[PDB]
Design an enzyme around this catalytic site. Structure first.
Site, PDB file in Angstrom:
ATOM      1  N   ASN A   1       1.124  -1.227  -0.170  1.00  0.00           N
ATOM      2  CA  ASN A   1      -0.193   0.169   0.489  1.00  0.00           C
ATOM      3  C   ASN A   1       1.011   1.336  -0.222  1.00  0.00           C
ATOM      4  O   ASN A   1       2.346   1.547   0.354  1.00  0.00           O
ATOM      5  CB  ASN A   1      -1.011   0.602   1.308  1.00  0.00           C
ATOM      6  CG  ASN A   1       0.060   0.437   2.335  1.00  0.00           C
ATOM      7  OD1 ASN A   1      -0.156   1.705   2.738  1.00  0.00           O
ATOM      8  ND2 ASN A   1       0.108  -0.381   3.149  1.00  0.00           N
TER       9      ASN A   1
ATOM     10  N   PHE B   1      -1.473   8.614   4.064  1.00  0.00           N
ATOM     11  CA  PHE B   1      -2.022   9.539   5.442  1.00  0.00           C
ATOM     12  C   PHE B   1      -3.480  10.156   4.781  1.00  0.00           C
ATOM     13  O   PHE B   1      -3.458  10.968   4.923  1.00  0.00           O
ATOM     14  CB  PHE B   1      -0.686  10.093   6.115  1.00  0.00           C
ATOM     15  CG  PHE B   1       0.108   9.730   6.896  1.00  0.00           C
ATOM     16  CD1 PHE B   1       0.863  10.722   6.912  1.00  0.00           C
ATOM     17  CD2 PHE B   1      -0.058   8.235   7.197  1.00  0.00           C
ATOM     18  CE1 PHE B   1       1.655   9.333   8.332  1.00  0.00           C
ATOM     19  CE2 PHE B   1       0.978   7.582   8.214  1.00  0.00           C
ATOM     20  CZ  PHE B   1       2.209   8.446   8.278  1.00  0.00           C
TER      21      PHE B   1
ATOM     22  N   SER C   1       6.126   5.642   8.474  1.00  0.00           N
ATOM     23  CA  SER C   1       4.873   5.244   7.189  1.00  0.00           C
ATOM     24  C   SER C   1       5.927   5.339   6.157  1.00  0.00           C
ATOM     25  O   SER C   1       7.387   6.271   5.999  1.00  0.00           O
ATOM     26  CB  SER C   1       4.165   5.890   7.324  1.00  0.00           C
ATOM     27  OG  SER C   1       3.797   6.259   5.874  1.00  0.00           O
TER      28      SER C   1
ATOM     29  N   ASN D   1       5.024   6.151   3.182  1.00  0.00           N
ATOM     30  CA  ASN D   1       4.775   6.533   2.254  1.00  0.00           C
ATOM     31  C   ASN D   1       4.919   8.365   2.292  1.00  0.00           C
ATOM     32  O   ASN D   1       3.741   8.899   1.504  1.00  0.00           O
ATOM     33  CB  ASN D   1       3.385   6.131   2.116  1.00  0.00           C
ATOM     34  CG  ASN D   1       3.434   4.448   1.261  1.00  0.00           C
ATOM     35  OD1 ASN D   1       4.390   4.045   1.264  1.00  0.00           O
ATOM     36  ND2 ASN D   1       2.022   3.768   2.516  1.00  0.00           N
ATOM     37  N   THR D   2       5.305   8.913   2.652  1.00  0.00           N
ATOM     38  CA  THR D   2       5.740   9.953   3.765  1.00  0.00           C
ATOM     39  C   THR D   2       7.072  10.746   2.929  1.00  0.00           C
ATOM     40  O   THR D   2       7.789  10.359   4.085  1.00  0.00           O
ATOM     41  CB  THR D   2       4.827  11.101   5.067  1.00  0.00           C
ATOM     42  OG1 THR D   2       3.642  10.921   4.218  1.00  0.00           O
ATOM     43  CG2 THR D   2       5.082  12.634   4.853  1.00  0.00           C
TER      44      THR D   2
ATOM     45  N   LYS E   1       6.448   4.396  16.567  1.00  0.00           N
ATOM     46  CA  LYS E   1       5.724   2.953  15.933  1.00  0.00           C
ATOM     47  C   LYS E   1       7.485   2.912  15.051  1.00  0.00           C
ATOM     48  O   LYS E   1       7.581   3.880  14.381  1.00  0.00           O
ATOM     49  CB  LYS E   1       4.617   2.447  15.621  1.00  0.00           C
ATOM     50  CG  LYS E   1       4.912   1.998  14.409  1.00  0.00           C
ATOM     51  CD  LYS E   1       3.163   1.988  14.405  1.00  0.00           C
ATOM     52  CE  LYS E   1       2.906   0.547  13.160  1.00  0.00           C
ATOM     53  NZ  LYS E   1       0.849   0.714  12.505  1.00  0.00           N
TER      54      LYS E   1
ATOM     55  N   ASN F   1       5.777  -1.703  11.526  1.00  0.00           N
ATOM     56  CA  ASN F   1       5.190  -1.114  10.289  1.00  0.00           C
ATOM     57  C   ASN F   1       5.775  -1.831   9.155  1.00  0.00           C
ATOM     58  O   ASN F   1       6.501  -3.011   9.444  1.00  0.00           O
ATOM     59  CB  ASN F   1       5.807   0.722  10.101  1.00  0.00           C
ATOM     60  CG  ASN F   1       4.526   1.182   9.585  1.00  0.00           C
ATOM     61  OD1 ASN F   1       4.202   1.420   8.266  1.00  0.00           O
ATOM     62  ND2 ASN F   1       4.188   2.620  10.047  1.00  0.00           N
TER      63      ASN F   1
HETATM   64  C1  LIG Z   1      -3.478  -0.606   4.062  1.00  0.00           C
HETATM   65  C2  LIG Z   1      -2.253  -0.503   5.080  1.00  0.00           C
HETATM   66  C3  LIG Z   1      -2.461   0.606   5.383  1.00  0.00           C
HETATM   67  C4  LIG Z   1      -1.815   0.979   7.002  1.00  0.00           C
HETATM   68  N1  LIG Z   1      -2.177   2.172   7.582  1.00  0.00           N
HETATM   69  C5  LIG Z   1      -1.366   2.868   8.242  1.00  0.00           C
HETATM   70  C6  LIG Z   1      -1.552   3.790   9.197  1.00  0.00           C
HETATM   71  O1  LIG Z   1      -2.048   4.359   8.613  1.00  0.00           O
HETATM   72  N2  LIG Z   1      -0.639   3.733   9.644  1.00  0.00           N
HETATM   73  C7  LIG Z   1      -0.017   2.205  10.342  1.00  0.00           C
HETATM   74  O2  LIG Z   1       0.831   3.571  11.811  1.00  0.00           O
HETATM   75  N3  LIG Z   1       0.604   1.537  10.383  1.00  0.00           N
HETATM   76  C8  LIG Z   1      -0.273   1.657   9.176  1.00  0.00           C
HETATM   77  N4  LIG Z   1      -0.422   0.181   8.130  1.00  0.00           N
HETATM   78  C9  LIG Z   1       0.827  -0.215   8.986  1.00  0.00           C
HETATM   79  C10 LIG Z   1       0.413  -1.725   9.470  1.00  0.00           C
HETATM   80  O3  LIG Z   1      -0.329  -0.943  10.646  1.00  0.00           O
HETATM   81  C11 LIG Z   1       0.870  -2.698  10.158  1.00  0.00           C
HETATM   82  O4  LIG Z   1       2.480  -2.201  10.755  1.00  0.00           O
HETATM   83  C12 LIG Z   1       1.546  -3.678   8.955  1.00  0.00           C
HETATM   84  O5  LIG Z   1       0.780  -3.998   8.097  1.00  0.00           O
HETATM   85  C13 LIG Z   1       2.550  -5.316   9.180  1.00  0.00           C
HETATM   86  O6  LIG Z   1       1.342  -5.568  10.039  1.00  0.00           O
HETATM   87  P1  LIG Z   1       0.158  -7.071   8.659  1.00  0.00           P
HETATM   88  O7  LIG Z   1       1.624  -7.566   8.510  1.00  0.00           O
HETATM   89  O8  LIG Z   1      -0.752  -8.269  10.262  1.00  0.00           O
HETATM   90  O9  LIG Z   1      -0.369  -6.409   7.997  1.00  0.00           O
HETATM   91  C14 LIG Z   1      -0.998  -0.168   6.841  1.00  0.00           C
HETATM   92  C15 LIG Z   1      -1.163  -1.243   6.722  1.00  0.00           C
HETATM   93  C16 LIG Z   1      -2.570  -1.386   5.398  1.00  0.00           C
HETATM   94  C17 LIG Z   1      -1.891  -2.830   5.101  1.00  0.00           C
HETATM   95  O1  LIG Z   2       2.559   4.034   8.424  1.00  0.00           O
HETATM   96  C1  LIG Z   2       1.723   3.956   7.824  1.00  0.00           C
HETATM   97  C2  LIG Z   2       0.665   4.747   6.042  1.00  0.00           C
HETATM   98  C3  LIG Z   2       0.612   3.995   5.743  1.00  0.00           C
HETATM   99  C4  LIG Z   2      -0.141   4.787   4.600  1.00  0.00           C
HETATM  100  O2  LIG Z   2       0.508   4.919   3.405  1.00  0.00           O
HETATM  101  O3  LIG Z   2      -1.163   6.293   4.784  1.00  0.00           O
HETATM  102  N1  LIG Z   2       1.012   2.917   4.888  1.00  0.00           N
HETATM  103  C5  LIG Z   2       1.780   1.997   5.389  1.00  0.00           C
HETATM  104  O4  LIG Z   2       2.149   1.153   5.130  1.00  0.00           O
HETATM  105  N2  LIG Z   2       2.149   2.395   6.946  1.00  0.00           N
END
Ligand SMILES: Cc1cc2nc3c(=O)[nH]c(=O)nc-3n(C[C@H](O)[C@H](O)[C@H](O)COP(=O)(O)O)c2cc1C
Ligand SMILES: O=C1C[C@@H](C(=O)O)NC(=O)N1
Ligand SMILES: O=C(Nc1cc(Cl)cc(Cl)c1)Nc1ccccc1C(=O)O
Ligand SMILES: CCCCCCCCCCC[N+](C)(C)[O-]
Length: 364
Positions: free
Chosen positions: A113, A117, A183, A185-186, A223, A252
């Site tokens: 992804n 944000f 993240s 992605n920023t 994190k 993350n």
């Molecule tokens: C679609 C998607 C969006 C995510 N958005 C955030 C986010 O906004 N903030 C954050 O701290 N982590 C975000 N993450 C990271 C997850 O919180 C997690 O750290 C990461 O996906 C690893 O766990 P998992 O393998 O069970 O998905 C996102 C992950 C995914 C898949």
């Molecule tokens: O912390 C984050 C931010 C998120 C996003 O792009 O919104 N994408 C991630 O995978 N981790």
């Protein structure tokens, strides 16, 4: 809530009909309406953990990024999660990256992804949480805490001030806050992970937190990425211990692409989550636990889809775990599955409860 029916039929069909972002939006909508299964799995005392100044009736939470805007919190507890983390939330509303920005890698049980944000912003989320603030107070007292993950706006000129605003606005409403400094992605965000300016950043965050009234004063966690050098990790451990940070979330998503990925979409830009991330995150937990001498609570996240996955992170030093990606493949039943398998493995390996297993690998 049959695990096999979701795993073999429902989910595969849903993924055939909907692209991942559409599926995500639909899932949030359904969940917030309680239209999804209610957990039949009733949590045993073995699964209870006390950390971060709270009771957690089970150690399995939903990771940040699923309920970004705080819309589905109650449906998520109903699903069986022992705690919920919403966010990331940015100070002002912003749209995030252009679509498409979420990609499925079925062959790898992984997702990539680059949402960027996308956020309703602090004000909207604040009012949403205020509308259910007292209900949450009872849930927390009942062992179902709420976390809020704070981000920063793309065009922000002062990262520390963005986070500080998040603390002031949503801190009074959260049991714990997460400073998301990882993240993928920023632009520039992850370099907030270096020492001198991490210390400056977190000093300001903690000061804002300490200025909140006692009953509204959240724990603060950091994190981190799976992608840090040894030097980075060493430095983070040092600052965390120096400033008295309450905990770490590890990890993350990764900007790495491990050898062996099969998905056609493996070369899309963004953070990779799911199975390919699993052991990378477990090893990062193991390292951070040792660097902090087991004194700093860790929430372990990355590639958890079974009781064994959860227990491995717990034994590596995690007091709690989260999952996200596994939910997108297996659906709601995966939550009860993980809990049931975790309890069985705990008995099997001679632990009286989750608490006894925390960090167990380091004591061999
Ligand atoms: C679609 C998607 C969006 C995510 N958005 C955030 C986010 O906004 N903030 C954050 O701290 N982590 C975000 N993450 C990271 C997850 O919180 C997690 O750290 C990461 O996906 C690893 O766990 P998992 O393998 O069970 O998905 C996102 C992950 C995914 C898949
Ligand atoms: O912390 C984050 C931010 C998120 C996003 O792009 O919104 N994408 C991630 O995978 N981790
Ligand atoms: O969240 C779900 N699906 C979903 C399906 C059901 Cl049946 C229940 C829940 Cl809670 C979630 N899917 C996703 C969430 C985030 C990113 C990508 C997807 C995806 O489908 O590839
Ligand atoms: C006014 C600011 C509006 C920002 C909207 C950001 C996209 C929100 C899309 C729904 C939530 N979700 C994470 C499932 O895509």
């Amino acid at each position: 809530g049959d695990e096999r029916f979701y795993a073999e039929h429902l989910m595969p069909t849903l993924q055939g009909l909907l692209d991942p972002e559409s599926a995500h939006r639909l899932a949030v909508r359904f969940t917030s309406l309680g239209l999804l299964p209610r957990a039949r799995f009733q949590d045993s005392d073995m699964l209870e953990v006390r950390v971060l100044g709270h009771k957690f009736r089970n150690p399995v939470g939903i990771a940040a990024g699923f309920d970004k805007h705080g819309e589905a919190v109650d449906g998520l507890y109903k699903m069986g999660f022992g705690f919920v983390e919403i966010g990331s939330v940015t100070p002002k509303p912003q749209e995030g990256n252009p679509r498409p920005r979420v990609f499925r890698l079925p062959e790898d049980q992984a997702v990539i992804n680059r949402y960027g944000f996308n956020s309703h912003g602090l004000s909207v989320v604040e009012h949403r949480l205020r509308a259910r603030q007292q209900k949450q107070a009872k849930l927390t007292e009942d062992g179902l805490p709420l976390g809020v993950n704070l981000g920063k706006n793309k065009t922000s000129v002062d990262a520390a001030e963005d986070y500080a605003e998040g603390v002031r606005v949503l801190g009074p409403l959260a049991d714990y806050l997460v400073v998301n400094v990882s993240s993928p992605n920023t632009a520039g965000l992850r370099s907030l992970q270096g020492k001198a300016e991490l210390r400056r950043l977190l000093t300001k965050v903690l000061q804002e937190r300490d200025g909140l009234r006692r009953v509204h004063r959240p724990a603060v966690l950091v994190k981190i990425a799976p992608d840090l050098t040894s030097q980075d990790k060493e430095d983070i451990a040092s600052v965390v211990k120096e400033l008295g940070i309450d905990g770490l979330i590890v990890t993350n998503t990764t900007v790495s692409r491990p050898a062996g990925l099969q998905g056609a979409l493996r070369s899309e830009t963004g953070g990779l989550s799911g199975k390919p991330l699993r052991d990378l995150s477990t090893q990062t937990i193991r390292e951070m636990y040792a660097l902090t001498q087991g004194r700093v609570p860790i929430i372990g996240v990355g590639g958890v889809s079974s009781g064994q996955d959860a227990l491995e992170k717990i034994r590596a030093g995690a007091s709690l775990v989260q999952l996200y990606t596994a939910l997108t493949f297996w659906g709601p039943p995966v939550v009860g599955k993980v809990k049931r398998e975790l309890e069985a493995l705990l008995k099997e390996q001679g632990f009286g409860g989750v608490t006894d297993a925390i960090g167990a690998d380091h004591r061999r």
